[PDB]
Symmetry: C3
């Protein structure tokens, strides 16, 4: 019962869950699987070998290529960019050499960021606008820059935690008060 703009093209075979919204001039390939309550903005593209979970918000001009997997509650900001071939050359087809990109639950991919294929983006990570991610991003990490480097940690709500990057510590979300534990430089929810 997904609603699909009449100008969108959803190829036979594609599966789109209930309450999803597909906007103007979107193309979804027939292999694609998209969950419930998603939103796909103007000119989105989705390939065949793609799984998108529930409540995923994909803004305008995002191309979700083959070998990209988005867990539930992922946010893909305006004009952010995925890839699936690491070292493309026009003369050499590298279909068989695709690298996976996995975006874990609740991660936010800022506007106009780019993700080099092969990276995993952890749960509730936050990739600043314009960043170029070329390594794995820890759960809750705030990363910015070209290439992206970690400068802090972000709570689920989306504000920085008073927690060092390394070692062992604990902190609370400035909004909800919920506690996070850092152990050897890895952040988790308590």
């Amino acid at each position: 019962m997904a609603t699909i703009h009449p100008t969108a093209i959803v190829d036979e075979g594609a599966r789109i869950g209930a309450h999803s919204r597909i906007w103007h001039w979107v193309h979804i390939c027939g292999g694609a699987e998209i969950g419930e309550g998603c939103s796909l903005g103007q000119n989105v593209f989705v390939g065949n070998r793609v799984r998108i979970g529930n409540r995923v918000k994909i803004q305008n001009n995002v191309s979700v290529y083959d070998n990209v997997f988005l867990e539930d509650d992922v946010f893909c900001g305006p004009s952010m960019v995925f890839t699936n071939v690491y070292n493309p050359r026009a003369a050499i087809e590298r279909k068989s050499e695709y690298r996976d990109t996995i975006v874990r639950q609740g991660a936010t991919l800022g506007a106009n960021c780019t993700v080099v294929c092969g990276a995993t983006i952890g749960r509730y990570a936050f990739v600043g606008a314009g960043a170029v991610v070329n390594k794995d991003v820890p759960d809750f990490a705030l990363v910015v820059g070209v290439p992206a480097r970690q400068i802090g940690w972000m709570s689920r709500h989306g504000e920085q935690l008073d927690l060092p990057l390394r070692g062992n510590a604990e902190a609370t979300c400035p909004h909800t008060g919920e506690r996070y534990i850092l152990t050897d430089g890895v952040c988790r929810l308590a």
Copy 2:
């Protein structure tokens, strides 16, 4: 032949106000609340939201989404695939319509190709944002800013070439193309 108006493939929703002599190109979608002035150009796959005002002689290149809460004064230039935003710290599971921040671009400013403006910034008159920069703080009138994140490296004339003015302090410079005079007062540049 005849002058282009609004390409037939564009979708201009009922209620949109578009001024005379503006050109709207292929597969543009303009929402019903928008207002767009005279003499504007909107490139391929532009999107324009409802809560948007665009002045006169605004040139918006391909693949720019002028989302709700973005406001563009006369003579602004939005380069190819530059990107605006309206939520500072988006999370898919957190509704943030009530927390949008306005982005205001003042007269004559240039936003280079593939730059990004983090919401809430104000871009000053005749500012120049280099290609690919990421703006996350206000940009003074006439400032030339580049980089991720953007830092000021000079001052640009209205004509669009750097002025011989220091970044800080008091100074004066003249545009050699027009002879227009600029005055720097404690690091703030104005046209004389």
Copy 3:
């Protein structure tokens, strides 16, 4: 001769060679010349004063504006960005001041990179994802960053060569055995 998606608009006059594929909602202007075996992805734009060679792969959301020239076997990654006016101001028409961008054979332009007009990108150069190029890129140079700086040398195959960044040296691609010579910091096939 090309295959053209029915939603594409290819203006009268445009020349597109055999075995080319034009995908959804692409607009090609009537002065354009595109060679054989090219692929133009979703929402590509091609201007009038444009020559694109053979086997050029142009991914989604690339606008090949007037005064951009792409040699054979060029790869333009997802949402990379060309320009033709150096210092745009909406009040001043600068058609007459366009600066050329020439991309030489086999160069790769990574996803979401940007090229400031006037640059020449050398043969088999490799511009990293997200870079902003504002100076000429040597043949075979690997450049990254905003603005782009050279960090190594890429073989035709698209893997770094065992060459110093500067100086005089030689190296061999392990995949093909082809030999490269670095002379005063200029790399060429022997």
